[PDB]
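Box 3.1. Reading complex inputs
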Amino acid sequence: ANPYERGPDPTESSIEAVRGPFAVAQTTVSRLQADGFGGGTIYYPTDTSQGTFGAVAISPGFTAGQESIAWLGPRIASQGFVVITIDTITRLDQPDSRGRQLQAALDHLRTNSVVRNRIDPNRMAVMGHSMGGGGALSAAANNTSLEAAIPLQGWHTRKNWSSVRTPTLVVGAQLDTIAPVSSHSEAFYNSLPSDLDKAYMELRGASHLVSNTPDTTTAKYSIAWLKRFVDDDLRYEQFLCPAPDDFAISEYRSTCPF
Amino acid sequence: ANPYERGPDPTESSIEAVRGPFAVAQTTVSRLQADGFGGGTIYYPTDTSQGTFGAVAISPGFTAGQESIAWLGPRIASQGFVVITIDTITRLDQPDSRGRQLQAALDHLRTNSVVRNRIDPNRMAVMGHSMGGGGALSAAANNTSLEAAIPLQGWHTRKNWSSVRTPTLVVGAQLDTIAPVSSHSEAFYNSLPSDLDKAYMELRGASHLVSNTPDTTTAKYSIAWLKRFVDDDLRYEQFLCPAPDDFAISEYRSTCPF
């Protein structure tokens, strides 16, 4: 019935895995080949027999490069997504610009010879860390057809996200001193529409740097969110609704059921 | 002849390598087993045939976990060091405490069953990021027998380090707005004794978090510094005196020649 479902029925184990059920490969987009962003690495499932996949673009924060978010690329792609980790046009680009560059990176995928025939360009999502997470929110606020947005310890001067229409998972780090949850993450959750499919997940005892090295909690709920909303995969609702019984989470709020 | 020399003569490539010439293994110190720190991972060369190695302890910064500085552990150990990356007793510990914990971690190596016969207990060093780098300075200020100290984007309320007697490499980030180099890194360099072997290296265009993700400049000059001063290895002077030409370095000062 759902033509976008990919992979076997999930379990806690399967969404926690460093590599999911899809073998992955990668290809590089040079800065020269990139129109509207600074280049990137595309991670993709090598299996073409299950249909095309949704696409996800991921942005780093201020002065940072792909390497600060790279581990997310193959970890998410191996669950059945085409994922591009981007560099920005300059190191100093601000959040709204990072959002336009995330959208440019997603749109580049339909022109890339390696992956253009592996994607469904109508099912795309945005993620990012700190200013890159502010970029994810801006990208969603500037494209109401995006299927999902995931700011990781997002930073933005804009606190009012009432125009977002894209299901959004706001991942905060409890002890963040750079993008403190009280003035960034939680403020974003509060201003997103009250009837939008949305969640706030706070990582217990976590610093701002939690997304820059492998974090199983970040990965598993990012994967469940992308499944639920890029693929409309109801098999993953169980992991998102209601609050998970998870010691790694210090706080949770959502508009469940979705 | 210098009995502490380990490995072949270096090149720029050899100090930039993600893994040096020594195969490494690891062992874990749990939080329960750790006296005076929060546990850690010890990375060590498995080849004992060239002699014992100097030891290095590395601390994360405020609110952060061991994983945020873990990349340094095997990258440095594979050049011929026993390296312990620590967690702190609580995530909110301040710099002076981080220094006492770095010292406790070094002292733990002296009786650790896996590495006691692999270390030279008289040749030890400290490093850390931000408050952990302030911790490295504090540890040196309370133990003048330490052979090297390397604060990475260090933060401390104490600005005067005139009683430090340990050769120190201060790695600042040009665009740091959290531990700005003018009031932190550069102040530390300036107050270290004028006749100490010391250097200041500023990373061009970099934020406060630059050394928390693999950064070739951070790695290569940390390795050269630890070689030069933990091992007294004059083969590594060439990389430190005079200023390296790297585009990634926006400022350099030192007391060369050492």
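In summary: Chain A has six helices and nine strands.
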